[PDB]
Short mmCIF file of C-alpha atoms (C1' of nucleotides) and ligand atoms in Angstrom, two decimals:
data_model
loop_
_atom_site.label_atom_id
_atom_site.label_comp_id
_atom_site.label_asym_id
_atom_site.label_seq_id
_atom_site.Cartn_x
_atom_site.Cartn_y
_atom_site.Cartn_z
CA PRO R 7 0.00 0.00 0.00
CA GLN R 8 1.35 3.43 -1.06
CA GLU R 9 2.98 5.59 1.63
CA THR R 10 0.72 8.50 0.66
CA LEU R 11 -2.15 6.38 2.03
CA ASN R 12 -1.18 6.70 5.70
CA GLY R 13 2.54 7.57 5.43
CA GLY R 14 2.03 10.74 7.44
CA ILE R 15 0.56 8.77 10.33
CA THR R 16 3.12 5.99 10.07
CA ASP R 17 6.06 8.43 9.91
CA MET R 18 4.65 10.15 13.01
CA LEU R 19 4.35 6.90 14.95
CA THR R 20 7.85 5.79 13.99
CA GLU R 21 9.31 9.12 15.09
CA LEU R 22 7.47 8.72 18.40
CA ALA R 23 8.84 5.19 18.65
CA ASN R 24 12.42 6.41 18.27
CA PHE R 25 12.10 9.06 20.98
CA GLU R 26 10.64 6.56 23.49
CA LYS R 27 13.50 4.17 22.85
CA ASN R 28 16.43 6.57 22.55
CA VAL R 29 15.45 9.42 24.88
CA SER R 30 12.77 8.24 27.33
CA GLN R 31 14.36 4.77 27.54
CA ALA R 32 10.87 3.22 27.40
CA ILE R 33 11.49 0.14 25.29
CA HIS R 34 7.96 -1.20 25.56
CA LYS R 35 6.50 2.10 24.33
CA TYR R 36 8.98 1.96 21.43
CA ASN R 37 7.56 -1.41 20.48
CA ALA R 38 3.94 -0.31 21.06
CA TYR R 39 4.43 2.57 18.62
CA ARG R 40 6.25 0.30 16.16
CA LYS R 41 3.43 -2.25 16.27
CA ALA R 42 0.82 0.47 15.71
CA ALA R 43 2.76 1.79 12.70
CA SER R 44 3.08 -1.73 11.26
CA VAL R 45 -0.62 -2.50 11.39
CA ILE R 46 -1.42 0.91 9.93
CA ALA R 47 1.18 0.52 7.17
CA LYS R 48 -0.63 -2.67 6.12
CA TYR R 49 -4.08 -1.07 6.23
CA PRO R 50 -5.31 -0.64 2.62
CA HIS R 51 -7.49 2.41 3.27
CA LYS R 52 -6.73 6.06 3.92
CA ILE R 53 -7.62 6.52 7.57
CA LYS R 54 -10.17 9.27 8.20
CA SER R 55 -10.27 9.26 12.01
CA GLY R 56 -8.64 8.04 15.19
CA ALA R 57 -11.73 5.89 15.75
CA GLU R 58 -11.20 4.02 12.47
CA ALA R 59 -7.59 3.33 13.42
CA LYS R 60 -8.45 2.28 16.95
CA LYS R 61 -10.21 -0.76 15.50
CA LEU R 62 -6.80 -2.14 14.47
CA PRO R 63 -5.00 -4.34 17.05
CA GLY R 64 -2.21 -2.37 18.69
CA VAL R 65 -3.91 0.99 18.15
CA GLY R 66 -5.27 2.21 21.48
CA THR R 67 -6.91 5.31 22.93
CA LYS R 68 -3.84 7.54 22.92
CA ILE R 69 -2.68 6.86 19.37
CA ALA R 70 -6.28 7.31 18.23
CA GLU R 71 -6.14 10.78 19.81
CA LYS R 72 -2.83 11.61 18.15
CA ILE R 73 -4.22 10.53 14.75
CA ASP R 74 -7.17 12.87 15.37
CA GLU R 75 -4.82 15.80 16.04
CA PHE R 76 -2.61 14.87 13.09
CA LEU R 77 -5.58 14.59 10.72
CA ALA R 78 -7.02 17.96 11.73
CA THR R 79 -3.77 19.92 11.92
CA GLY R 80 -1.27 18.05 9.75
CA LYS R 81 1.09 17.67 12.70
CA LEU R 82 1.44 16.79 16.38
CA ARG R 83 2.37 19.47 18.96
CA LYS R 84 4.42 17.12 21.15
CA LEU R 85 6.39 15.80 18.19
CA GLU R 86 7.04 19.31 16.86
CA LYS R 87 8.34 20.28 20.29
CA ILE R 88 10.66 17.31 20.72
CA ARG R 89 12.04 17.75 17.17
CA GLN R 90 13.21 21.27 18.10
CA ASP R 91 14.72 20.29 21.44
CA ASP R 92 18.50 20.32 21.14
CA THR R 93 19.12 17.74 23.86
CA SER R 94 16.52 15.22 22.74
CA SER R 95 17.22 15.55 19.04
CA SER R 96 20.95 15.06 19.70
CA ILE R 97 20.46 12.05 21.98
CA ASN R 98 18.13 10.54 19.40
CA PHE R 99 20.68 11.18 16.64
CA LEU R 100 23.76 9.78 18.36
CA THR R 101 22.02 6.40 18.70
CA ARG R 102 22.32 5.95 14.94
CA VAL R 103 25.98 5.11 15.61
CA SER R 104 26.36 1.34 16.11
CA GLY R 105 27.46 0.70 19.70
CA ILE R 106 25.94 3.93 21.01
CA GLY R 107 22.65 3.07 22.72
CA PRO R 108 20.32 5.33 24.74
CA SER R 109 22.64 5.24 27.78
CA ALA R 110 25.84 6.23 25.96
CA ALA R 111 23.96 8.79 23.85
CA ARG R 112 22.56 10.39 27.01
CA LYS R 113 25.98 10.51 28.65
CA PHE R 114 27.69 12.01 25.60
CA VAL R 115 25.07 14.74 25.29
CA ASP R 116 25.23 15.46 29.05
CA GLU R 117 28.93 16.28 28.63
CA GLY R 118 28.36 18.37 25.51
CA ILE R 119 29.11 15.78 22.81
CA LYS R 120 26.19 16.00 20.36
CA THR R 121 27.45 15.53 16.79
CA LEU R 122 29.52 13.11 14.70
CA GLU R 123 32.14 15.86 14.61
CA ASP R 124 32.07 15.98 18.40
CA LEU R 125 32.51 12.21 18.46
CA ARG R 126 35.33 12.50 15.93
CA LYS R 127 37.13 14.83 18.39
CA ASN R 128 36.66 12.52 21.39
CA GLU R 129 37.99 9.12 20.31
CA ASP R 130 39.35 8.40 23.83
CA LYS R 131 35.77 8.34 25.15
CA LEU R 132 34.59 5.77 22.59
CA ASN R 133 34.84 2.00 22.99
CA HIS R 134 36.02 -0.24 20.13
CA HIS R 135 32.53 -0.99 18.83
CA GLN R 136 31.60 2.67 18.90
CA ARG R 137 34.73 3.67 16.98
CA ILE R 138 33.89 1.22 14.23
CA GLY R 139 30.26 2.41 14.23
CA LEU R 140 31.46 5.99 13.80
CA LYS R 141 34.02 5.00 11.20
CA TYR R 142 31.36 3.40 9.00
CA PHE R 143 28.42 5.57 10.02
CA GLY R 144 27.21 6.18 6.45
CA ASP R 145 27.99 2.76 5.04
CA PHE R 146 26.10 1.04 7.84
CA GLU R 147 22.99 3.08 6.99
CA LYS R 148 23.06 1.95 3.34
CA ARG R 149 21.18 -1.10 2.19
CA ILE R 150 22.71 -4.02 0.32
CA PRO R 151 21.29 -4.88 -3.10
CA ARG R 152 20.67 -8.61 -3.63
CA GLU R 153 23.37 -8.80 -6.29
CA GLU R 154 25.95 -7.76 -3.71
CA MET R 155 24.49 -10.22 -1.21
CA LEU R 156 24.97 -12.98 -3.79
CA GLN R 157 28.58 -11.94 -4.36
CA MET R 158 29.15 -11.83 -0.62
CA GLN R 159 27.55 -15.26 -0.18
CA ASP R 160 29.80 -16.62 -2.94
CA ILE R 161 32.83 -15.56 -0.88
CA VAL R 162 31.52 -16.82 2.46
CA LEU R 163 30.48 -20.21 1.10
CA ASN R 164 33.73 -20.66 -0.82
CA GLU R 165 36.04 -19.78 2.08
CA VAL R 166 34.08 -21.80 4.66
CA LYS R 167 34.36 -24.94 2.47
CA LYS R 168 38.04 -24.20 1.91
CA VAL R 169 38.66 -24.26 5.67
CA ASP R 170 36.80 -27.55 6.11
CA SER R 171 34.49 -29.04 3.50
CA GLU R 172 32.36 -30.55 6.27
CA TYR R 173 31.19 -27.18 7.56
CA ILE R 174 27.61 -26.27 6.67
CA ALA R 175 26.86 -22.57 6.19
CA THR R 176 23.60 -20.78 5.40
CA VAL R 177 23.01 -17.07 4.83
CA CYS R 178 19.66 -16.36 6.49
CA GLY R 179 17.49 -13.29 7.08
CA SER R 180 15.15 -11.78 4.48
CA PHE R 181 17.85 -12.52 1.89
CA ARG R 182 17.14 -16.23 2.19
CA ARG R 183 13.45 -15.38 1.64
CA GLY R 184 14.35 -13.71 -1.65
CA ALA R 185 14.45 -10.06 -0.61
CA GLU R 186 15.72 -7.57 -3.23
CA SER R 187 17.91 -5.85 -0.64
CA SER R 188 19.27 -6.57 2.82
CA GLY R 189 20.43 -4.50 5.79
CA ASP R 190 23.29 -6.81 6.70
CA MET R 191 24.37 -10.45 6.28
CA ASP R 192 23.50 -13.14 8.83
CA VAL R 193 25.41 -16.42 8.55
CA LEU R 194 24.60 -19.58 10.49
CA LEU R 195 27.40 -22.10 10.65
CA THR R 196 27.67 -25.66 11.90
CA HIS R 197 29.93 -28.72 11.67
CA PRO R 198 29.25 -32.40 12.46
CA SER R 199 31.96 -32.41 15.15
CA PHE R 200 29.88 -29.92 17.20
CA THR R 201 26.67 -31.00 18.94
CA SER R 202 24.76 -30.09 22.10
CA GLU R 203 26.47 -32.90 24.02
CA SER R 204 29.86 -33.28 22.36
CA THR R 205 32.90 -31.03 22.00
CA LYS R 206 32.08 -27.33 22.10
CA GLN R 207 35.35 -27.13 20.21
CA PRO R 208 36.30 -23.46 20.52
CA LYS R 209 38.19 -22.99 17.23
CA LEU R 210 35.44 -23.92 14.77
CA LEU R 211 34.27 -20.30 14.54
CA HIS R 212 37.72 -18.77 14.85
CA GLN R 213 39.10 -20.75 11.89
CA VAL R 214 36.34 -19.41 9.63
CA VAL R 215 36.62 -15.79 10.79
CA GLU R 216 40.39 -16.12 10.32
CA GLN R 217 40.18 -17.32 6.72
CA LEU R 218 37.65 -14.59 5.91
CA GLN R 219 40.11 -12.07 7.34
CA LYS R 220 42.99 -13.67 5.43
CA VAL R 221 41.29 -13.08 2.05
CA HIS R 222 40.54 -9.54 3.19
CA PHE R 223 36.78 -9.97 3.13
CA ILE R 224 36.25 -9.28 6.84
CA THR R 225 37.81 -5.89 7.63
CA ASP R 226 36.84 -5.20 11.25
CA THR R 227 35.61 -7.03 14.36
CA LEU R 228 32.87 -5.64 16.63
CA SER R 229 32.78 -8.66 18.91
CA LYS R 230 33.89 -12.29 18.81
CA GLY R 231 33.49 -15.25 21.12
CA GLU R 232 33.35 -19.02 20.66
CA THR R 233 29.83 -19.01 19.21
CA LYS R 234 29.18 -15.56 17.76
CA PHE R 235 31.06 -13.10 15.59
CA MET R 236 29.82 -9.65 14.64
CA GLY R 237 31.96 -7.57 12.33
CA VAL R 238 32.43 -5.67 9.12
CA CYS R 239 33.14 -6.87 5.61
CA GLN R 240 33.70 -5.46 2.11
CA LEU R 241 33.48 -6.84 -1.43
CA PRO R 242 36.73 -6.47 -3.36
CA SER R 243 36.42 -3.37 -5.52
CA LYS R 244 35.68 -4.55 -9.05
CA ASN R 245 38.61 -2.79 -10.67
CA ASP R 246 39.05 0.85 -11.70
CA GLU R 247 35.55 1.28 -10.29
CA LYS R 248 34.21 2.84 -7.09
CA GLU R 249 34.88 0.87 -3.90
CA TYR R 250 31.96 -0.97 -2.29
CA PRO R 251 30.49 0.22 1.04
CA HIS R 252 31.57 -1.63 4.20
CA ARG R 253 28.82 -4.02 5.35
CA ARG R 254 27.73 -5.56 8.64
CA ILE R 255 28.08 -9.32 8.85
CA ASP R 256 27.25 -11.68 11.70
CA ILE R 257 28.43 -15.28 11.91
CA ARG R 258 27.12 -17.72 14.52
CA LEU R 259 28.18 -21.29 15.25
CA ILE R 260 25.27 -23.54 16.21
CA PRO R 261 25.31 -27.17 17.39
CA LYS R 262 24.36 -29.54 14.53
CA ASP R 263 21.30 -30.90 16.36
CA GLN R 264 20.03 -27.34 16.70
CA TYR R 265 21.13 -26.03 13.33
CA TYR R 266 17.84 -26.36 11.47
CA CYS R 267 15.77 -24.85 14.28
CA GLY R 268 18.33 -22.02 14.03
CA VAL R 269 17.98 -21.63 10.25
CA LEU R 270 14.20 -21.77 10.44
CA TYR R 271 14.10 -19.08 13.12
CA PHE R 272 16.73 -16.74 11.64
CA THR R 273 15.13 -16.98 8.21
CA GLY R 274 11.80 -15.70 9.54
CA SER R 275 9.91 -13.72 8.84
CA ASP R 276 8.97 -12.62 12.36
CA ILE R 277 5.27 -12.96 11.62
CA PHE R 278 5.86 -16.40 10.13
CA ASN R 279 7.78 -17.43 13.25
CA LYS R 280 4.85 -16.23 15.39
CA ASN R 281 2.28 -18.24 13.44
CA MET R 282 4.43 -21.35 13.23
CA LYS R 283 4.88 -21.06 16.97
CA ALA R 284 1.10 -20.85 17.36
CA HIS R 285 0.37 -23.90 15.24
CA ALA R 286 3.07 -26.01 16.91
CA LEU R 287 1.53 -25.28 20.30
CA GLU R 288 -1.86 -26.43 18.96
CA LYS R 289 -0.20 -29.69 17.94
CA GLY R 290 1.35 -29.98 21.38
CA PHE R 291 4.89 -28.81 20.64
CA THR R 292 6.92 -25.87 21.86
CA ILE R 293 9.37 -24.44 19.37
CA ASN R 294 12.08 -21.87 19.99
CA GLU R 295 15.25 -21.00 18.05
CA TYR R 296 17.09 -24.03 19.48
CA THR R 297 14.74 -26.99 19.67
CA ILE R 298 11.25 -28.35 19.24
CA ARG R 299 9.83 -30.32 22.16
CA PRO R 300 6.63 -32.28 22.86
CA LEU R 301 4.35 -30.98 25.61
CA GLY R 302 2.75 -33.55 27.92
CA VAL R 303 -0.84 -33.42 29.17
CA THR R 304 -0.08 -31.18 32.17
CA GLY R 305 2.22 -29.07 29.99
CA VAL R 306 5.64 -30.50 30.87
CA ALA R 307 8.17 -30.17 28.05
CA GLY R 308 9.87 -33.45 27.14
CA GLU R 309 13.27 -33.77 25.45
CA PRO R 310 14.13 -32.01 22.15
CA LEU R 311 13.12 -33.99 19.06
CA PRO R 312 15.65 -34.96 16.38
CA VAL R 313 15.72 -32.37 13.60
CA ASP R 314 17.82 -33.06 10.50
CA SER R 315 16.23 -30.53 8.16
CA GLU R 316 13.76 -27.63 8.17
CA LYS R 317 11.05 -29.92 6.78
CA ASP R 318 11.40 -32.26 9.77
CA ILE R 319 10.05 -29.36 11.83
CA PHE R 320 7.07 -28.80 9.52
CA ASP R 321 6.39 -32.53 9.57
CA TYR R 322 6.30 -32.74 13.38
CA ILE R 323 3.41 -30.28 13.35
CA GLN R 324 1.66 -31.50 10.19
CA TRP R 325 2.43 -28.49 8.02
CA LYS R 326 3.35 -28.80 4.35
CA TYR R 327 6.93 -27.62 3.86
CA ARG R 328 6.99 -23.95 2.85
CA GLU R 329 9.76 -22.32 0.82
CA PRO R 330 11.60 -19.39 2.40
CA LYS R 331 10.20 -17.22 -0.43
CA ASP R 332 6.67 -17.87 0.91
CA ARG R 333 7.37 -17.16 4.60
CA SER R 334 6.14 -13.57 4.82
CA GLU R 335 3.52 -14.84 7.31
"C1'" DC A 1 -5.59 -2.69 38.16
"C1'" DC A 2 -1.51 -4.03 36.67
"C1'" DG A 3 2.19 -7.07 34.97
"C1'" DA A 4 3.84 -8.68 30.14
"C1'" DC A 5 5.74 -7.04 26.17
"C1'" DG A 6 12.08 -13.16 23.57
"C1'" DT A 7 16.26 -14.07 24.87
"C1'" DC A 8 20.86 -14.22 24.95
"C1'" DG A 9 26.15 -13.97 23.45
"C1'" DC A 10 29.86 -10.57 24.11
"C1'" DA A 11 32.24 -6.34 25.95
"C1'" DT A 12 32.55 -3.67 29.70
"C1'" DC A 13 31.24 -1.78 34.10
"C1'" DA A 14 30.41 -2.23 39.30
"C1'" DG A 15 31.70 -4.51 43.41
"C1'" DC A 16 33.94 -7.64 46.29
"C1'" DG Y 1 41.81 -11.17 40.34
"C1'" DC Y 2 36.68 -12.96 40.13
"C1'" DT Y 3 31.39 -12.73 39.65
"C1'" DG Y 4 27.43 -10.65 38.39
"C1'" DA Y 5 24.98 -6.51 36.21
"C1'" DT Y 6 24.31 -3.63 32.57
"C1'" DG Y 7 24.48 -1.86 27.72
"C1'" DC Y 8 23.96 -3.14 23.28
"C1'" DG Y 9 22.67 -5.41 19.19
"C1'" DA Y 10 19.75 -8.49 16.63
"C1'" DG C 1 1.09 2.46 24.98
"C1'" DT C 2 -1.84 -1.48 24.39
"C1'" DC C 3 -3.57 -5.63 25.62
"C1'" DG C 4 -5.69 -8.85 28.57
"C1'" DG C 5 -5.95 -11.87 32.92
NA1 LIG Q 401 -7.16 -0.92 18.88
NA1 LIG Q 402 23.25 2.81 18.18
NA1 LIG Q 403 20.51 2.79 16.41
NA1 LIG Q 404 37.55 -31.93 3.39
#
DNA sequence: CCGACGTCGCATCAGC
DNA sequence: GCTGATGCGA
DNA sequence: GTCGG
């Protein structure tokens, strides 16, 4: 549905969401506003009153009132006020740097640090993550066209197999669902030698990160432990041509017996996950990102069931296997 | 009326 | 030094 | 902020 349908209202609610999260530190209000904007974004009619909107789940009394004011005046007094406020606008802005959350943003602004330039001048006050976030501030806000995702995947899948051909690696996220662009790259990795009961062998991830660094694909590291890496990567510049933006990439090592529950979950979408979770319950199973387990008559979860593919999961709950490209809901 | 609204791996702080 | 809490991201 | 026990 076109943005000119309710884009004004949805923009307003998203701006409210950001201020609750970044300034008020009210995470649940952030999500309430986000949810309201989602349901409205999907609504295929131009809203004519707060009352019409209130019928939608997640739209309550107060948002209904704001929509009334917005519809009559083309704005919202409280939002106009907070936009102008130097402190709040700065705090809100600083959070766009990866590694700077509401707490760090507040603290920086309290001591007079309000702009990227200010940050640039105060490196000593920034942790490693925050320095990398600042360094790639613009690149991190750019999206990744699917063609670049495919090129990136080519590299990841090639180098993983080169380290050990028994690794299994899957790029997940909306990309796996066939999205035309991505925000980052999420890689789930496993190996037969690693299960929930056997060796947690703590070099499986390191060896892969290392090789990806060795071929100069991974350029920076935000964080890295035995099961999860978050960092930065860049396609080699196809020659004589402009250099590609630096991209965010996550790589997680998952036990083999939990790998497919992991792929399912990190492929999404979120709404699909929710519904699949519903259905599974109805069939007497509880599914999370790690395992699927039978529920007994009084609701006691038994042991995790063997899962050797995504479709195993669907089969446990009597659902026809659905392609990632059809998992919007 | 009033608590729930994922959860968790990693980096870093707070405290002992 | 260690343990647990907190910030952050996803 | 919204929902629901
Ligand atoms: Na409603
Ligand atoms: Na941030
Ligand atoms: Na942010
Ligand atoms: Na081999």
